[PDB]
């Protein structure tokens, strides 16, 4: 900006004044500015289907902590989607969990996620992102973080 | 020295003169001239602290200065002319990053 001084009493607004620039804050763009979180038009089918065309994967095996919760903090909250297919709920503890989760991404097509969190007693887990849009499968796996 | 630190826009804001009030900081200038030859300043004080310093150090982005004097540290929010913060020292490091100390 070109920075101009004020008199608030009665001012002056004149062509001159000199610039300095100040660095502003980052904008990060989310996976929730774009999405409508949903319930499926056809989960059974869709669920699978989305796999069919779309599916990328990441696996981790969890050996120092046996808790979802960290993961959980990043996922419900980052994606802004619904955990489910009756596979959401956990009390202050729970043995196993799946979020098979929903919403639709911008540009029309959908971004779909299944997270099977598996507890043997370590957690090893299958995160699936399946999508009706290509950019989202790679994204979900990242974005969730 | 006085206590001053310069924003790379081009304002070395110092304070005081030698024992004058701190009331005097500023300098964005406005003009250009030859290497050997000499230059003009702007005029618009801010400040009129009390504590008498001997350190000025800019924030790592010039920005937040922490100034120590009388043995305590006033940090200023500078443009703000706000006290960014204060306490008593002994010795210092900014976490260079520009976010801790």
From Swiss-Prot, chain A:
It is found in: Cytoplasm, Cytosol; Golgi apparatus membrane; Cytoplasmic vesicle, COPI-coated vesicle membrane. It comes from the Eukaryota. Disulfide bonds: none annotated. Belongs to the COPG family. Oligomeric complex that consists of at least the alpha, beta, beta', gamma, delta, epsilon and zeta subunits. Interacts with ZNF289/ARFGAP2 through its C-terminal appendage domain. Interacts with EGFR upon EGF treatment; interaction is essential for regulation of EGF-dependent nuclear transport of EGFR by retrograde trafficking from the Golgi to the ER. The coatomer interacts with KDEL receptors; the interaction is important for retrograde trafficking of KDEL-bearing proteins from the Golgi to the endoplasmic reticulum. Interacts with COPB1. Interacts with TMED10 (via C-terminus). The coatomer is a cytosolic protein complex that binds to dilysine motifs and reversibly associates with Golgi non-clathrin-coated vesicles, which further mediate biosynthetic protein transport from the ER, via the Golgi up to the trans Golgi network. Coatomer complex is required for budding from Golgi membranes, and is essential for the retrograde Golgi-to-ER transport of dilysine-tagged proteins. This is Coatomer subunit gamma-1. It comes from Mus musculus. The chain holds residues 730 to 874 of 874 of the full protein.
Swiss-Prot record, chain B:
WD repeats lie at residues 48-86. Signal peptide: none annotated. Disruption phenotype: The knockout of the gene results in early embryonic lethality with no viable embryos recovered at 12.5 dpc. It is found in: Cytoplasm, Cytosol; Golgi apparatus membrane; Cytoplasmic vesicle, COPI-coated vesicle membrane. It comes from the Eukaryota. Oligomeric complex that consists of at least the alpha, beta, beta', gamma, delta, epsilon and zeta subunits. Probably interacts with PEX11A. Interacts with SCYL1. Interacts with JAGN1. Belongs to the WD repeat COPB2 family. The coatomer is a cytosolic protein complex that binds to dilysine motifs and reversibly associates with Golgi non-clathrin-coated vesicles, which further mediate biosynthetic protein transport from the ER, via the Golgi up to the trans Golgi network. Coatomer complex is required for budding from Golgi membranes, and is essential for the retrograde Golgi-to-ER transport of dilysine-tagged proteins. This is Coatomer subunit beta'. It comes from Mus musculus (Mouse). The chain holds residues 303 to 403 of 905 of the full protein.
């Amino acid at each position: 900006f070109t920075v101009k001084d004020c008199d608030p009493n009665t001012g002056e607004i004149d062509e001159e004044g000199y610039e300095d620039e100040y660095v502003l804050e980052d904008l990060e763009v989310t996976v929730a500015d774009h999405i409508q979180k949903v319930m499926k038009v056809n989960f059974e089918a869709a669920w699978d289907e989305v796999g069919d065309e779309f599916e990328k994967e990441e696996t981790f095996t969890l050996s120092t902590i046996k808790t979802l919760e960290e993961a959980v903090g990043n996922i419900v909250k980052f994606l802004g989607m619904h955990p489910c297919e009756r596979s959401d709920k956990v009390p202050e503890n729970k043995n196993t969990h799946t979020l098979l989760l929903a919403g639709v991404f911008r540009g029309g097509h959908d971004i779909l996620v299944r997270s099977r969190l598996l507890l043997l007693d370590t957690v090893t887990m299958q995160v699936t992102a399946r999508s009706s849009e290509e950019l989202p499968v790679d994204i979900i796996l990242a974005s969730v973080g | 020295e006085p206590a001053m630190s310069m924003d790379a826009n081009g304002k070395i804001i110092w304070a005081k003169h030698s024992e004058v009030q701190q009331a005097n900081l500023k300098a964005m200038g406005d003009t250009e001239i030859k290497d050997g030859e000499r230059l003009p300043l702007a005029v618009k004080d801010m400040g009129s602290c009390e504590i008498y310093p001997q350190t000025i150090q800019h924030n790592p982005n010039g920005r937040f200065v922490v100034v120590c004097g009388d043995g305590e540290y006033i940090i200023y929010t500078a443009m703000a002319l706000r006290n960014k913060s204060f306490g008593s020292a002994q010795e210092f490091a900014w976490a260079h990053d520009s976010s801790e100390y």
